[PDB]
């Protein structure tokens, strides 16, 4: 049922090695680039699939070129069977790296330094007028080159939505927007089926970094969206910070105060991480947990 068979060759250049990712919206392959001789990420969707996402992904991926923490754009194309985008292949996914950890926790050193990079990548996609709307560990991966193995990359834009018009004015929010992202890391605004803003990506970051440093969220073994929403709406979020650096109270207080229209203070949140590291002699050149 795969769109492309193993060893299938696209535009006489990208040879399919294997499927690496799947789901109702399209498929990701590792391919060999027959020109440059490196392996690449090949994303395909059926030409027939009623919901066409790749055109979104390509537009966002092209707007972000020159920014760090984004895959290099290699190619894109349509035809009778599928559309495709070719981009730089990245390495180990943050979801897998967390799961590999003895306690399913990262050190604070790993956590805070991943935080800085993911926050940069969130500021980046916001700066070109898009929300990610599915910030979660599996949407980030570390590099697979001598030049990138300590760099964290935002992988996918399949759920992104433009929050601006042409001028950089914020779009009117719909009265209701059905939340489409991952239950675990969704803001209370997303659970309430409200138009997501930039703050909702920063909510997802907050929940992700707590899960990194502590190893679980309180609503961990709940897959029912509405249940998870009711737990979050009531949960005393300061509790989440019991075993986090105190500077995170600034992060929490800031994002709790934002609405759909308001531009977040990204430097406030960047400062939380840097001040947290500094208090604790955490250097930028420290091994990540999965090294040694
Ligand atoms: Cl779906 C999943 C769940 C949990 C852990 C790993 C997973 O597998 C993938 C597989 C591929 C990707 N994406 C990518 N990977 C590697 N290089 C890439 N360049 C651009 C995208 C891309 C993401 C998760």
Q: At what angle do helices 266-279 and 108-127 cross, to 10 degrees?
A: 160
Dihedrals phi, psi of 228, to nearest 5 degrees: -60, -40
As beta bridge partners, residue 45 has 83
198-214 helix and 248-257 helix, angle to the nearest 10 degrees: 150
Pick the catalytic residue: 2, 68, 134, 265?
A: 134
> What is the position in ligand 1's atom list of the atom closest to the CA of 28?
11
DSSP, collapsed to helix, strand or coil, labels residue 114 as helix
Residue 95 · residue 165 · CB < 8 Å: no
Resolution in A: 2.1
Is residue 87 within 8 Å of 36, Cβ to Cβ? no
- Count CA atoms within 13 Å of residue 179 on its CB side: 24
User: What does the buried/exposed string (b/e) look like for 231-247 if buried means 16 or more CB atoms within 10 Å of the residue's CB?
Assistant: ebeeeebeebbeebbeb
Beta bridge partners of 130: 162
In the reported structure, the alpha carbon of residue 74 is separated from the centroid of ligand 1 by a whole-number distance in angstroms of: 17
26 marked among binding-site residues: yes
Q: Which of 285, 133, 265 is nearest to 205 (CA)?
A: 133
Neighbouring residues of 79: CB distance < 8 A, sequence distance ≥ 6: 47
The answer, yes or no, to whether any atom of ligand 1 lies below 6 A from the CB of 87, is yes
d(CA 183, CA 219): 10
- Residue 40 near ligand 1, beta carbon < 6 Å: no
- As a whole number of angstroms, the distance between CA 73 and CA 65 comes to 7
Q: Is 253 helix (H, G, I), strand (E, B) or coil?
A: helix
Does the annotation mark 12 as catalytic? Answer: no
Type and span of the H or E element at 95: helix 94-100
SS3 content of the chain, % helix, strand, coil (to 5): 35, 15, 50
Q: Per residue in 216-225, is it b (16+ CB within 10 Å) or e — as a string?
A: ebebeebeee
Residue 155, ligand 1, Cβ within 6 A: yes
Ligand 1 atom having least distance to the Cα of 88: 19
Is position 229 annotated in a ligand binding site? no
Method for this entry: X-ray
Residue nearest to atom 15 of ligand 1 (CA): 90
Q: How far apart are CA 109 and CA 183, in angstroms?
A: 27
Helix (H, G, I), strand (E, B) or coil at 226: helix
Contact in structure between 39 and 31 (CB atoms under 8 Å): yes
Measured distance CA(270)–CA(188) in Å, rounded:
23
Give yes or no for a contact between 104 and 215, defined as CB atoms under 8 angstroms apart: yes
Cα distances (angstroms) measured from residue 24 to each of 82, 142, 189, 226: 14, 25, 25, 22
| Displacement of CA 285 from its chain's centroid (Å) | 23
Distances (CA, A) of 177 to 35, 57, 83, 274, 292: 44, 20, 27, 35, 45
Domain positions in the chain are: 17-30+41-90, 91-292
In whole angstroms, give the CA distance from residue 26 to residue 24.
6
């Amino acid at each position: 049922a795969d769109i492309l068979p193993a060893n299938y060759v696209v535009k006489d250049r990208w040879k399919v090695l294997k499927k690496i990712g799947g789901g109702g919206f399209g498929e990701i392959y590792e391919a060999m680039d027959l020109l440059t001789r490196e392996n690449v990420a090949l994303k395909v969707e059926s030409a027939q699939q009623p919901k066409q996402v790749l055109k979104m992904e390509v537009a966002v991926l092209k707007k972000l070129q020159g920014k760090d923490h984004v895959c290099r754009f290699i190619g894109c194309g349509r035809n009778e069977k599928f559309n495709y985008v070719v981009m730089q292949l990245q390495g180990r996914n943050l979801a897998d790296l967390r799961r590999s950890q003895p306690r399913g926790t990262f050190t604070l050193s790993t956590t805070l330094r991943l935080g800085k990079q993911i926050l940069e990548s969130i500021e980046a996609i916001h700066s070109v007028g898009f929300l990610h709307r599915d910030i979660k560990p599996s949407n980030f991966a570390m590099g697979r080159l001598p030049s990138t193995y300590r760099k964290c990359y935002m992988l996918d834009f399949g759920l992104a939505r433009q929050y601006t018009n042409t001028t950089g004015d914020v779009r009117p929010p719909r009265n209701v927007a059905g939340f489409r992202g991952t239950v675990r890391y969704a803001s209370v605004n997303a659970h309430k089926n409200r138009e997501m803003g930039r703050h909702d990506d920063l909510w997802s970051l907050f929940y992700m970094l707590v899960e990194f440093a502590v190893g679980q969220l309180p609503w961990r073994k709940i897959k029912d969206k509405e249940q998870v929403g009711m737990i979050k709406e009531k949960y005393e979020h300061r509790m989440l910070l019991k075993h986090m650096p105190s500077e995170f109270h600034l992060f929490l207080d800031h994002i709790a105060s934002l609405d759909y229209f308001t531009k977040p203070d990204y430097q406030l949140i960047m400062s939380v991480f840097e001040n947290s590291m500094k208090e604790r002699g955490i250097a930028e050149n420290e091994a990540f947990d999965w090294e040694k």
